[PDB]
Structure formats: structure tokens, C-alpha cells
Amino acid sequence: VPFVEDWDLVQTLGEGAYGEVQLAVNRVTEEAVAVKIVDMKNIKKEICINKMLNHENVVKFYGHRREGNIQYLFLEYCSGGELFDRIEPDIGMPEPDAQRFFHQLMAGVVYLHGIGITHRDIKPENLLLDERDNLKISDFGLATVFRYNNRERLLNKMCGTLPYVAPELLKRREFHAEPVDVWSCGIVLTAMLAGELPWDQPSDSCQEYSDWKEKKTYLNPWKKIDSAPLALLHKILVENPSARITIPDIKKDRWYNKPLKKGA
Numbered sequence: 001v002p003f004v005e006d007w008d009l010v011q012t013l014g015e016g017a018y019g020e021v022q023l024a025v026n027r028v029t030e031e032a033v034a035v036k037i038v039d040m041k042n043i044k045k046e047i048c049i050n051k052m053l054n055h056e057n058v059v060k061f062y063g064h065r066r067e068g069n070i071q072y073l074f075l076e077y078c079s080g081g082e083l084f085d086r087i088e089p090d091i092g093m094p095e096p097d098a099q100r101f102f103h104q105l106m107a108g109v110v111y112l113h114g115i116g117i118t119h120r121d122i123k124p125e126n127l128l129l130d131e132r133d134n135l136k137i138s139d140f141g142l143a144t145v146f147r148y149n150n151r152e153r154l155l156n157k158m159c160g161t162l163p164y165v166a167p168e169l170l171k172r173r174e175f176h177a178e179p180v181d182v183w184s185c186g187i188v189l190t191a192m193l194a195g196e197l198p199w200d201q202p203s204d205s206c207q208e209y210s211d212w213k214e215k216k217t218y219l220n221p222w223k224k225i226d227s228a229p230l231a232l233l234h235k236i237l238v239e240n241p242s243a244r245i246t247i248p249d250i251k252k253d254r255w256y257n258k259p260l261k262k263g264a
């Protein structure tokens with residue numbers, strides 16, 4: 001199959017700080033891929049981390065190539081687009097769908113954590129869907145190593161996206177990586193079941209966050225959410241990261257294990 005790497009750019013799939021992501025269609029194979037085209041006039045690290053990842057719930061990395069100041073990253077294309085666009089404003093989505101997506105999210109995150117990588121910016125805009133609605137974690141531009149040679153490193157850089165960030169990132173100088181990812185997964189689950197985000201940020205200066213800590217679940221978004229998934233959100237959206245539920249224990253939750261969706 002000669003000329004297997006020859007692509008034509010057809011559409012702006014997204015747009016970041018450095019550059020954009022484009023859909024690129026192949027020559028002889030006719031393959032489709034996504035290309036992150038960053039204009040340097042960070043990505044070095046983003047490539048290194050990308051080179052480590054091999055999981056069915058992580059957007060696959062193919063390769064890279066620079067031409068002067070413009071670094072190209074060739075990555076798996078996700079024709080289902082962002083999870084963000086499967087969430088109906090003020091409604092969310094059907095609970096069986098949210099559950100499946102959450103199962104796949106946990107699988108992707110467990111994998112990353114297992115190899116000592118934290119994503120640090122999990123949100124529906126970064127969670128993409130393949131042709132069969134399978135969820136793929138993307139955009140490792142903020143990601144970093146939290147474990148190496150079996151030895152955990154505490155994080156201190158504030159980053160991510162405020163509605164999704166865990167409160168210790170706003171309150172403590174140092175914090176453990178994995179609980180921060182767990183928290184953002186909870187915010188994602190809330191958005192899926194409610195079609196709204198619970199607060200601007202989890203600080204005591206935010207009334208919606210204060211309401212949540214006071215357990216006023218008779219307010220939105222919580223009142224839209226069934227008791228079972230809500231009980232899980234109570235365990236995830238815990239202000240103390242050391243008390244917060246861990247992924248092994250999320251996997252044992254009653255809602256997490258509730259039979260909801262028929263197979264294809």
C-alpha cells in the first residue's frame with residue numbers, strides 16, 4: 001500500500017491555545033486521522049506522554065513531525081465528536097448512557113493512573129466518542145507524571161478548568177494527583193445526569209458549593225439526579241481528598257453496578 005501517509009485537511013475539529021486540530025483524510029488507504037497543528041511562533045512533553053499511552057479508552061497517538069515552527073501531532077480521529085455535545089442543556093442524557101460513558105471514563109483513568117500519568121483537565125470537551133460511541137480520553141497538553149519508579153510525586157501546579165477542579169487545588173500548596181482526577185470525573189457525571197455544572201468553582205466564596213457542603217440536594221442540579229447516582233456523587237464530591245472515594249471503591253458502588261443498559 002504505497003503512499004500510506006498523505007493527508008488532506010478538510011475541517012477544523014477544534015481549537016486550543018497553541019493551535020488547532022484538523023481532520024486529515026489519507027491518500028491510498030483513505031484513512032482518517034486528527035492532526036494537532038501547534039504554532040510555536042509544552043508540546044515536547046505532550047508528545048512524550050502521548051508515546052506512552054495504549055488503551056482502548058485513550059485517544060491513540062500515531063506520530064509527530066515539525067516544519068520550522070509548526071509541530072504536527074497525528075492522533076486517532078473520533079467521528080462521534082465530544083461528549084460535551086451529547087449532553088442536553090438543563091437535561092443531561094439518559095441514565096443508562098451516562099452510566100456506560102462513566103464506566104469507560106473510569107477504565108481510561110485507571111489505565112493512566114496505573115502508568116503514573118494524571119490528565120489534570122478531564123471535562124466533556126476533552127472526552128471524545130468513536131464511531132461506536134466509545135469514549136476516548138484526549139488532550140494531554142496539561143498531563144504530567146505523578147509516579148515514577150514506584151514513587152509518588154505530590155503536585156503543586158494549579159491547572160485545569162475551574163468548574164471541574166478539585167477544591168484542594170485551590171486551598172493547599174501540595175496535593176495528590178489521583179483524587180483531583182476523580183473529582184473532575186464526578187463533575188463530568190453531574191453534567192451527564194443534569195445538563196448543568198454545579199458551581200463556578202469549589203471555593204467557600206461560591207454559594208452553590210456551600211449549598212452542596214450543607215447537603216441541600218433539594219436544589220439543582222442535585223434534585224434532577226436519582227438517589228442511586230446521587231449517593232455516588234456524595235462519595236466523589238468530598239472536599240477532603242484523603243476522605244474522597246477512590247476508583248477501586250467507585251467500582252464497588254451500587255449505582256456503578258446497577259444493571260441499566262441492554263447490549264447492542
Ligand SMILES: CN1CCN(c2ccc(-c3cnc4[nH]c5cnc(C#N)cc5c4c3)cc2)CC1
Nearest residue numbers: 013014021034059075076077078081082138139
Ligand atoms: C460542529 N461540531 C464541532 C465539534 N465537533 C467535533 C469536535 C471534536 C472532534 C475531534 C475528533 N477526533 C479527535 N481526535 C483528537 C485527538 N486529539 C485531540 C486533541 N487535543 C483532539 C481530537 C479530536 C477531536 C471532532 C468534531 C463536532 C461538530
